[PDB]
Design an enzyme around this catalytic site. Structure first.
Site, short mmCIF file in Angstrom:
data_model
loop_
_atom_site.label_atom_id
_atom_site.label_comp_id
_atom_site.label_asym_id
_atom_site.label_seq_id
_atom_site.Cartn_x
_atom_site.Cartn_y
_atom_site.Cartn_z
CG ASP A 474 -2.08 0.93 1.07
OD1 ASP A 474 -2.51 1.48 0.29
OD2 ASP A 474 -3.02 0.85 2.12
CG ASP A 544 -9.25 2.64 -0.04
OD1 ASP A 544 -9.06 1.47 0.01
OD2 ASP A 544 -8.57 3.35 0.35
#
Lengths: 723, 723
Positions: A474, A544
């Protein structure tokens, strides 16, 4: 694949799949763009003389560089249009004059120094043309690199600069390609978005002037994906001319169409020239990333299907390239940060019982990391929380029948970390300026060898400590105060690109060191969902936002370029988070099972009937996973065009398919709806689970009468199998 | 005019005409844009916190520069949008951090150093706000300059940079303004074109990304006029919100709208940053040209009418600012170059007999100038062709009752000229590179004092040699190989702007030295038709294309910004030239009499009936000239929207008007057509010559029934007078 040069006509003809791309040498070594479109056997290479378009050759007033269509135009010696590159000399001049010197043609496709690129597995798959240009006065050489694939309508382009002179040359702009279309009678498509809503399709008419998408974030970004297309006015998903331009790079980009006074369209793409320079000392070179150019006359689906096959099989790499990807569950929202070893294992048994294949451990396993505030950069297992380390947890998860995966965020460092206290100069920064934070963290200076070596060492120490077979990598902020204390003033503007080169080196090393690990890239969702990252990590966290309705748009737009195999999609729990919506477990499954499928919830909060649905979703996806991840994908109805979304997957032999249909805000007492399919054998009959037997021709030409329904969110999925 | 600062709210409120422009200080000295629109008494200055928009103040995570709407944004310390300016430091960093320091408000409007600008004649006409920003670390000061006019909805903006530090600062970008609108629910308009077809109106929806018009030609250009507007989706000529942005500058420009992920629209405009830098040594300053910002809620006509009055009366200058402009005839096509004194005088008697007021002598009166090839730069009267010089010719023309005018092209030099042989280094060039030509000529380096002094001297010698009262100042190519042997390497990229500053100094001197001369600027027609030039020369040659149909579009688009007083329009002879068209002498008159009227033909080729029409056109235009050149102009029907064009002029007291109607390709047996007027007193009755008496209300609300006609080109003009 079949690349030729005709010495009589001085024409280069690149034949890629069923497309032709043609160039021609013109006058004293100029290189002209002739044609790019459906394959022709030959195409012969007016009015280049125009008021206020001046003449580079005083002896020849028949042309201007302001009117000649080009492959790699410069500004300053008669072209007033947007240049592909620009170089400043020691004397302050920015005038450069590249002319053709020579060329070579060879089989196969080269690697690009320091960079990702589409590739071949056999030389027969493609042929490459290198056209060497030069400005003798200053010793600047630019090699234009072109590859044509045999099997696909794909031309790839990049440029390589080399200083063969004795002075410094500063590159102010170094785009990967530029092409002058003879008309501007097209719409353009690009993929703007934001966090939680990446890659919406935006189609607009061209303006006489410039229109562009770009990123200045040091990352390809949520805000603009590095993809643009020109499409015929009447082109749609199923028919019509489409030209796609996809940048294989994960940092700053510019993707631009400039239409000039004569309504020719110059399309160009490459590293964003904004805030960028590159210094070439004598003997030094600069390689641009490549742009992958796709033509179709079968509409947007034709173009996308080309990118999907090319990117899935000849860009993505590693052991999992052609492998079905595991159904995973992320164990974050089970605990946020609140964790220790006792829970995790029973949780893993519950998840294993449901058939889930991969257990993933999220943030806060390391150091003092316990909100979005701390310990980033200190990648040692916090052996309070996991006293038996990752090994004991992992091995138990494995004995339960699930693979074990982990989250890392190696490009970030917390001001409150040991790394930062030992090496504060290791972050991106500029002298004497405040260090702006994103989520309480700073960006590590990956332009530095010591930084990169440290990350490789540290992450390897963790990854080799346990039987880990999945890593989510990430990156949760964008670059500010871009600079490096390890570069001199004259190279400061190389920081962003050198950072990306550093990350690429790091990722290449990490994926090679851990060949049993499926790596998934992530950047607050799909903030770096680009072909550059795909070369290193074969799948990506799409967004997300896991809201079912929101994902219809995100997945539809992402699929314009990226293969479904790479497109992470997870079922999450509701109340949804980014948005606020309630859709059935069935519905969220339907949207997520149209991607690379997984879960993102707390299994401890599920009702038996819910786990029972999940057990069924898992079994269902296992049955169609090969079809979803590796089948041919067809978009049918667009959520950017109305309240419906629909798409389908078809097996290579057309014997099996999976169809998905969605509608939001279906009104009371509504008209009947229909869905016409694509990609089937019209002469074959197909059984549709729960709807009977239909001819392939019936399904495509008359369509399926959709079971009438009404409500806030309609969601349907059908398996088809040839009788 | 009424500019205030409220210390309680830290809000600046600029009241200009019936518009408000509001800004507010925010947190630690940031300057936010609040509002620009219809006047309000007050407006109070959400969600600045956004994923991936980082925080400049670590102690305050409520905002980002990526989300705060600003007046003069920078890139690099949290804003990722297009910056208004950028500066590179000696250490190679480009990070700058301007914060509010102080401000001052005063009556009137300042002059801008070295530059044209709108002005006031009395302090009461406007008030000016200067907001001083500073980056203390580097000693960079930027003063944002704002002026609000009392009478008009006009805000003008510029910025002044000053290095108050001890290091070098390099300006990479220095735009004149930037404004962040809170939504992007607008179309934009800009004015693209080409030689022979300047300033077509192009209206397009905004894209999420950047769209821009620019010039890289060293001149504002035929290809893009330095004007853009944002307009409400439903706005038209007569109603709706319009925001215009007009750059008072005649060189390179960028005019851009960038829409970000949150659909806010950043509009910015200034000197094109492309190929531009400006070095500020300690103690040095840089003044940007200004941008004139106009708001209307009365549609495009409301905006245009503001620009027309502002530009005609408070931008244009000199003895002829408020004076009716002469009906002229250009005596080129009478001879091309083929001339000597005997013809000219009898010609002048014929022209005088027709009532024409100004006799103009075109190219090739000087040196060895006898095609578009020679003697440019050698500005001495070729005393073969005119043995008695300009004086004898001029004085005879005067005794015939006509004024005498002349063509010059002082920015050009021929390689085959004496000037070039004595001073080859006086042209724009770069070391060791070929000198590209446009129409066989090179560009003089007006960035050099010696060059400018030479031109001032030489042109003055000619102009003071005869009773000349009109000069056409032409420039017939664009800049290539931009550089100066009189600047060091570190300032080479200042060449284009310094050139324009030089031209401005030269023109200011020339128009002051010759106050009895009406100067008309020209650049292959309307290639520099911009507010910068208008400040020096109060009218402009609109286009080299004098075709009646072509001029409908050119004049309609030019009028969007520029007053009709400045808009040269001439009747020429047919076969037309650029295009190929045949329209009646009546028709061409109708189009040209809707501008600043004149002739461009060979009077020796005219039939008696033709001269008779011309005699009548001249008498007619004299009767309506005050109304055309100084009346309020209303566009009625757009040739960009169909086959009709229509417009009208109304006197200040609304007692008189002139209406013009045009239609191309009127079909057989067509529907009846109507024309609704604007700008009249609804309670007044008006006599229309040849159509009877109508109420003003009837004319505007029901419209004129147009006399039915059909044919290739319909052309009608009517005078209206209150009964």
């Amino acid at each position: 694949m079949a690349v030729t040069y005709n010495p009589q006509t001085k024409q280069f003809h690149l034949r890629a799949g069923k497309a032709s791309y043609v160039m021609q040498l013109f006058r004293s070594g100029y290189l002209a763009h002739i044609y790019w479109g459906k394959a022709v056997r030959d195409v012969r290479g007016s009015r280049l003389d125009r008021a206020f378009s001046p003449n580079p050759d005083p002896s020849d007033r028949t042309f201007s560089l302001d009117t000649l269509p080009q492959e790699y135009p410069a500004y300053g010696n008669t072209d007033f249009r947007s240049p592909a590159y620009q170089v400043q000399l020691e004397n302050g001049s920015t005038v450069t004059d590249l002319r053709y010197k020579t060329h070579r043609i060879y089989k196969g496709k080269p690697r690009l120094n320091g960079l990702p690129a589409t590739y071949v597995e056999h030389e027969q798959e493609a042929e490459t043309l290198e056209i060497v240009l030069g400005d003798a006065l200053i010793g600047l050489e630019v090699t234009l690199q072109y590859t044509a694939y045999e099997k696909w309508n794909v031309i790839t382009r990049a440029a390589r600069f080399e200083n063969k002179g004795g002075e410094r040359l500063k590159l102010l702009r170094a785009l990967s390609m530029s092409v002058d279309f003879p008309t501007a009678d097209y719409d353009w498509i690009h993929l703007p978005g934001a966090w939680g809503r990446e890659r919406w399709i935006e189609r607009r008419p061209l303006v006489t002037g410039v229109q562009a998408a770009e990123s200045r974030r040091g990352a390809s970004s949520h805000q603009q994906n590095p993809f643009i297309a020109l499409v015929a006015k009447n082109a749609d998903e199923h028919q019509g001319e489409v030209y796609g331009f996809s940048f294989v790079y994960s940092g700053n980009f510019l993707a631009q169409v400039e239409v000039d006074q004569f309504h020719t369209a110059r399309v160009s793409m490459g590293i964003n020239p904004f805030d960028f320079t590159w210094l070439l000392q004598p003997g030094e070179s600069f390689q641009t990333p490549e742009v992958v150019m796709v033509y179709s006359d079968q509409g947007l689906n034709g173009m996308s299907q080309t990118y999907h096959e090319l990117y899935r099989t000849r860009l993505a790499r590693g052991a999992f390239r052609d492998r079905e990807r595991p159904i995973l569950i992320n164990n974050w929202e089970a605990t946020y940060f609140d964790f220790n070893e006792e829970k995790l294992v029973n949780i893993a048994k519950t998840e294993a019982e449901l058939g889930i294949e991969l257990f993933v451990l999220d943030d806060g396993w390391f150091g003092k990391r316990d909100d979005d505030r701390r310990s980033l950069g200190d990648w040692i297992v916090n052996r309070r929380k996991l006293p038996n380390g990752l090994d004991g947890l992992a091995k138990q998860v494995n004995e339960l029948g699930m693979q074990f995966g982990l989250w890392v965020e190696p490009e970030m460092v917390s001001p409150n970390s040991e790394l930062y206290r030992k090496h504060p100069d290791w972050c991106l920064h500029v002298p004497n300026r405040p260090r702006s934070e994103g989520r309480n963290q700073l960006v590590l200076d990956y332009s530095r060898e010591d930084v990169c070596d440290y990350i490789i060492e540290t992450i390897s120490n963790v990854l080799a400590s346990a039987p880990i077979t999945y890593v989510k990598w990430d990156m949760n902020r964008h670059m500010t105060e871009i600079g490096s204390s390890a570069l001199p003033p004259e190279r400061q503007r190389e920081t962003a690109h050198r950072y990306m080169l550093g990350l690429y080196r790091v990722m290449d090393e990490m994926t090679s060191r851990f060949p049993h690990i499926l790596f998934e890239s992530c950047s607050g969702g799909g903030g770096r969902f680009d072909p550059g990252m795909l070369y290193y990590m074969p799948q990506t966290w799409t967004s997300d936002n896991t809201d079912a309705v929101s994902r219809l748009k995100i997945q539809y737009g992402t699929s314009l370029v990226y293969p479904i195999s790479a497109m992470g999609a997870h079922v999450s729990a509701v109340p949804n988070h980014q948005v606020g919506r309630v859709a059935s477990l069935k519905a969220r499954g339907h949207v997520a099972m149209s991607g690379n499928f997984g879960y993102e919830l707390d299994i401890t909060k599920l009702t038996e009937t819910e786990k029972q649905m999940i057990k069924q979703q898992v079994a269902f996806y296992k049955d169609v996973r090969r079809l979803v991840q590796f089948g041919t994908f067809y978009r049918l109805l667009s959520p950017f065009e109305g309240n419906e979304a629909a798409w389908m997957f078809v097996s290579a032999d057309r014997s099996e398919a999976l169809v998905a249909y969605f509608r939001v805000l279906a009104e009371a007492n509504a008209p009947l709806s229909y869905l016409r399919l694509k990609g089937l054998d019209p002469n074959q009959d197909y059984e549709i689970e729960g709807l009977g037997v239909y001819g392939g021709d019936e399904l495509m030409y008359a369509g399926v009468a959709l079971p009438y329904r009404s409500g806030d969110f309609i969601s349907m999925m059908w398996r088809l199998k040839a009788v």
